[PDB]
């Protein structure tokens, strides 16, 4: 993996590391999962950590996180996080994100919305003015 790739995964790791101490605990994993609408049990959190806890000290450090992330990338069907994310938004895969597609992602992620907010979000990202957000515009905005 390149240094830029390592940096991206550091960003991801930091979205979980609540205390910023360099490790992801079962409790931290659970907080993120709870925020996403999931309520895993303690043993469940323990197995998720265990499967990736290479040295077995009970928490996940960045090297272990990287091994996991690297394993995912080093696979034919795995794309870059940014591209994978764009595809979550662009469900019909035509390369453009519609208002309906944006409302769907926001709803799925528990983000409240109004039509005006959605229209301004698109407008702000819509550089070529075609009424939708293409990949290039998606990258620029994100």
């Amino acid at each position: 993996l390149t240094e830029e790739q390592i940096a991206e995964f550091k960003e991801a790791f930091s979205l979980f590391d609540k205390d910023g101490d360099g490790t992801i605990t079962t409790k931290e994993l659970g907080t993120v999962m709870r925020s996403l609408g999931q309520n895993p049990t303690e043993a469940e959190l323990q197995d998720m950590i265990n499967e990736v806890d290479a040295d077995g000290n009970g928490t996940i450090d960045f090297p272990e996180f990287l091994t996991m992330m690297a394993r995912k990338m080093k696979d034919t069907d795995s794309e870059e996080e940014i591209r994978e994310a764009f595809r979550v938004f662009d469900k019909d895969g035509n390369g453009y994100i519609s208002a309906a597609e944006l409302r769907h992602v926001m709803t799925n992620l528990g983000e409240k919305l109004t039509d005006e907010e959605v229209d301004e979000m698109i407008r702000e990202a819509d550089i070529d003015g075609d009424g939708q957000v293409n990949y290039e515009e998606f990258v620029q905005m994100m």
């Binding site: 979980f16 499967e51 990736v52 995912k72 996080e81 992620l109 983000e111 907010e117 979000m121 994100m142």
Partner: peptide, 27 residues
């Protein structure tokens, strides 16, 4: 009053969702 913050929050929430799935897909 820019909308960039909402866009950025969605990306971050999705990135977290994908990492959780990765903890599950691992094998």
């Amino acid at each position: 009053k820019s909308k960039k913050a909402v866009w950025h929050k969605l990306l971050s929430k999705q990135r977290r969702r994908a990492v959780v799935a990765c903890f599950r897909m691992t094998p």
